[PDB]
């Protein structure tokens, strides 16, 4: 059950990656907000499902894969079998979601979180239903090679507040950033 959510951290120039790593220096409190938002379920016997494309999965340090206490599904048309550590591999968002109903998965999933990359995010962002986008706006330009698609405002509404989401500008290592929530339903 649950809902369909996208989570992303983006630079002013809409960059989410550079050469297998983040465009910016490590931001520990941002990391920690991603972990908590994706892991938290207040339901007993369920876990959240984290969906990620091949490049996002490999951008995570092996020391952090799989993502503990979450079901990890890799989305890829080119891998031949689930990468070591991953639970499932699916060829598309559709089948991933579909997957979410057979034997293990409809009785075990709470929320669904899409953690990257651009093509997964485009796929989803343009998928029927009630989707939420949790966006961290890093207020600085960073040289990037991977990007999040423009958010078609007035299609997507910004929510003034949402539980567990800080409303204030944050700062780390002198980079300012803020958390934003957007939603849609079609
Ligand atoms: C989970 O651990 C790590 C994950 C990454 C890179 N990824 C995939 C990442 C980081 N931040 C994010 N923040 C928000 N808001 N949304 C995301 N979708 C997101 C995804 C890099 C690391 O170190 C280089 C890690 O080590 C802790």
Cis peptide before 66 (omega within 30 of 0): yes
Of 4, 27, 30, 67, which one is the catalytic site residue? 30
90 beta partners: 75
What does the alpha-carbon distance between residue 142 and residue 26 come to, in Å, rounded to a whole number? Answer: 13
Residue nearest (by alpha carbon) to ligand 1 atom 17: 8
Q: What is the resolution of this structure in A?
A: 1.8
Task: Specify the CATH superfamily of domain 1-186.
Answer: Dihydrofolate Reductase, subunit A (3.40.430.10)
Burial of 172 (0-12, 13-18, 19+ CB in 10 A): middle
What does the alpha-carbon distance between residue 128 and residue 169 come to, in Å, rounded to a whole number? Answer: 32
Question: Is residue 80 a known part of a binding site?
Answer: no
What does the alpha-carbon distance between residue 110 and residue 90 come to, in Å, rounded to a whole number? Answer: 19
Q: Identify how the structure was determined.
A: X-ray
Ligand 1 centre distance from Cα of residue 21 (Å): 9
Ligand 1 centre distance from Cα of residue 31 (Å): 6
Closest among 94, 92, 90 to 82, alpha carbons compared: 90
Q: What's the CA angle centered on 17, arms 62 and 185, to 5 degrees?
A: 100
Domain ranges of the chain: 1-186
Q: How far is CA 160 from the centre of its chain?
A: 20
């Amino acid at each position: 059950v649950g809902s369909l959510n996208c989570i992303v951290a983006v630079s002013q120039n809409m960059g989410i990656g550079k050469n297998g790593d983040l465009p910016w220096p490590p931001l520990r409190n941002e990391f920690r907000y991603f972990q908590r938002m994706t892991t938290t379920s207040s339901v007993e016997g369920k876990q959240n499902l984290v969906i990620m494309g091949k490049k996002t999965w490999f951008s995570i340090p092996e020391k952090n894969r799989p993502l503990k206490g979450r079901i990890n599904l890799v989305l890829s048309r080119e891998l031949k079998e689930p990468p070591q550590g991953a639970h499932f591999l699916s060829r598309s968002l559709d089948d991933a979601l579909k997957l979410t109903e057979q034997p293990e998965l409809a009785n075990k999933v709470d929320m669904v979180w899409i953690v990257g990359g651009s093509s997964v995010y485009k796929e989803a962002m343009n998928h029927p239903g009630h989707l939420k986008l949790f966006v961290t706006r890093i207020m600085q330009d960073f040289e990037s090679d991977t990007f999040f698609p423009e958010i078609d405002l007035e299609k997507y509404k910004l929510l003034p507040e949402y539980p567990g989401v800080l409303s204030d500008v944050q700062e780390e290592k002198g980079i300012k950033y803020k958390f934003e929530v957007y939603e849609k339903n079609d």
